[PDB]
């Protein structure tokens, strides 16, 4: 390895449209989206996976105006993942999560399920009621998923780039997200880079650990 | 392979204090922290890596009150990583970032360096001025780092648990973070699980893709 993956992966600046993910890789990227951890296993997210030319064109509309520099990446990659966060944490979602954990066999007694729900609601209530920052809390979980995802697809031997440079209002409208309870946060094209990928040859750059890291 | 890692890793609930990271492992986890991607390569973060008894005890003060259920994880794990975000994006940091990229060989001409600085400011200015969401934006990059980190350390064969159940006010004060320009967001003990980790054998649970994922 993973350290070689972390040291070798890069944000692809141009994708080769003739190179598609294998069907097995297309299944594997969905497994990575699904199985990321999240606070309280709340999983406050939705994913749009666009692999058709028609689907990628709808996403790529959000890369207009100042964001045109990202439009080619969304059009030319094999698959394009739109990471969305819930806009609100409702008690029906909270019920969905604890019932799924029960179906999966994580509770020995109904008292353990009850205690799991109560613990989750203490955190949800802290964010919804006391802090009124639940929207930001869930978005943070989505960014955590993205980070898991970017390392995972690199480890699969796939190129990708994370994109914030897009119009989320246009993307949300295009897919009806506001009415369904979600908002788009990061767009991640996945596929294979082309000869036009000028970043595929540049050395990686990071600030040194003597600036960013304190050992104690 | 990385998919096996994603399906088999877990949030460790109790650590064996006698099982330390090897010397190479301690260096590798710092490489994972450093080499995470971030928007504009802004790297708006600081990490505290606690591996001494005193250092872990200091981090573990933050797991008081309602959060005692996370305190033993911090005391017992080999290393405890504190992920911090910058509290404001100042132009001295932006300069450090582009100068480092320059030092690493990423600009062919001074016009390319100047072009890189200009784009980074467009995004930094959009957040600090137009959106007034500067702290949230950098906090999102830290969560992305955490997501990368958790998958990396699992791929290294190390146990870990991300922790939000801590008092960031106490942790920030314990380490003088506010005055240094940072705030703590998530605590990640890393090491090896013990027999008391009730989560190491439980099946993993996630919502079905027919709820969370749309194909287009
Ligand atoms: C951002 C974040 C914060 C978390 N905080 C805690 C915590 O304070 N205490 C704890 O026991 N687990 C914590 N977890 C562990 C999650 O509950 C766990 O990720 C979730 O149930 C998914 O299970 P898994 O990580 O084993 O796959 C945290 C996870 C995340 C992603
Ligand atoms: C238009 C565009 C938008 C980007 N948005 C993001 C983003 O939102 N988050 C992110 O982590 N990286 C983003 N990146 C890539 C980062 O610049 C990149 O991760 C960083 O410079 C480190 O390089 P690496 O990813 O190649 O290691 C974007 C790149 C482009 C071209
Ligand atoms: C269904 O089993 C589950 C499912 C989800 C679980 C989630 C958590 N725990 C057990 C869980 C468990 O059972 C072991 C332990 C306490 C905890 C603190 C947290 C957290 C998640 C959890 O995120 C924020 O701080």
CB contact under 8 A, B49 and A216: yes
Is the minimum distance from the CB of B204 to ligand 3 under 6 angstroms?
A: no
Is the minimum distance from the CB of B177 to ligand 1 under 6 angstroms?
A: no
Taking residue B141's Cβ as centre, other Cβ atoms within 10 Å add up to 23
Resolution (angstroms) stands at 1.8
- CA B149 and chain centroid, separation: 7
**What are the C-alpha distances in Å from A158 to residues A11, A60, B22?**
11, 20, 30
Nearest to B30 by CA among B16, B50, B11: B50
Tell how far the Cα of B164 is from the centroid of ligand 1, in angstroms.
8
Give the residue extent of every domain in chain A. Answer: 1-216
* Residue B72 token pair: 């033993």
Q: How many CB pairs under 8 A join A and B?
A: 217
Facing residues of B185 across strands? none
* Residue A110 token pair: 């109904």
B213-215, strands of its sheet edge to edge: A159-160, A182-191, A79-86, A45-50, B213-215
**How far, in Å, CA of A20 to CA of A23, rounded?**
9
Partners of residue A33 in chain B, C-beta under 8 Å: 212-213
**How far, in Å, CA of B160 to CA of B81, rounded?**
10
**How far, in Å, CA of B30 to CA of B48, rounded?**
10
* Residue A14 token pair: 């141009």
CB contact under 8 A, A144 and B143: yes
- Among A6, A8, A11, A148, residue to substitute to test ligand 2 (most atoms within 8 Å of Cβ): A11
Q: Are A148 and A44 in contact (CB under 8 A)?
A: no
Burial of B24 per CB tally in 10 Å (0-12, 13-18, 19+): exposed
* Residue A3 token pair: 């350290």
Is the minimum distance from the CB of B99 to ligand 1 under 6 angstroms?
A: no
Q: Are A12 and A160 in contact (CB under 8 A)?
A: yes
B212 touches A at CB < 8 Å: yes
Partners of residue A37 in chain B, C-beta under 8 Å: 11, 150, 162
Residue with the two structure tokens 């008092």: B167
Nearest to B189 by CA among B84, B85, B75: B75
Q: Is the dihedral of CA B170, B174, B180, B184 positive or negative?
A: negative
Report how this structure was experimentally obtained.
X-ray
3 state SS of A186 = strand
**How far, in Å, CA of B37 to CA of B41, rounded?**
6
Burial of B166 per CB tally in 10 Å (0-12, 13-18, 19+): buried
DSSP string of A60-129, one letter each residue: HTTS-GGGGGGHHHHHHSSEEEEEEEESS--HHHHHHHHHHHHHTT--SSHHHHHHHHHHHHHHHHIIII
Catalytic residue among B27, B53, B136, B164: B164
Nearest to A144 by CA among A156, A126, A162: A162
Residues in chain B: 216
Facing residues of A83 across strands? A47, A186
Q: Say which ligand is closest to the CA of A37.
A: 1
Element (H, E) at B123: helix B110-125
Cβ-proximal residues to A48 (8 Å cutoff; 6+ apart), any chain = A55, A59, A81, A82, A84, A175, A184, B213, B214, B216
**How far, in Å, CA of A23 to CA of A29, rounded?**
10
**How far, in Å, CA of B189 to CA of B56, rounded?**
9
CB < 8 Å from A in window 75-94 of B: none
A108 touches B at CB < 8 Å: no
DSSP string of B46-82, one letter each residue: EEEEE-SHHHHHHHHTTS-GGGGGGHHHHHHSSEEEE
């Amino acid at each position: 390895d993973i350290i070689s993956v972390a040291l070798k992966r890069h944000s692809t600046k141009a994708f080769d449209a003739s190179k598609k993910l294998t069907p097995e890789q297309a299944e594997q990227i969905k497994t990575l989206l699904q199985y990321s951890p999240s606070s309280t296993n709340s999983q406050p997210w939705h994913f749009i996976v666009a692999s058709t030319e028609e689907g990628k064109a709808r996403v790529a509309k959000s890369a207009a105006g100042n964001y045109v520099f990202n439009e080619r990446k969304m059009l030319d990659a094999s698959h394009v993942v739109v990471f969305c966060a819930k806009t609100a944490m409702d008690d029906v979602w909270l019920k969905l999560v604890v019932d799924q954990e029960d179906a999966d066999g994580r509770f020995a007694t109904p008292e353990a399920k009850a205690a799991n729900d109560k613990g989750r609601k203490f955190f949800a209530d802290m964010h919804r009621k006391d802090l009124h920052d639940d929207a930001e809390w869930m978005a943070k979980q989505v960014y955590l998923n993205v980070g898991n995802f970017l390392l995972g697809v690199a480890a699969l031997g796939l190129d990708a780039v994370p994109i914030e440079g897009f119009d989320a209002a246009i993307l949300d409208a295009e897919f009806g997200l506001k009415e369904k309870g979600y908002t788009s946060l990061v767009v991640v094209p996945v596929g294979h880079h082309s000869v036009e990928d000028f970043n595929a040859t540049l050395p990686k750059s990071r600030l040194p650990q003597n600036i960013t890291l304190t050992e104690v």
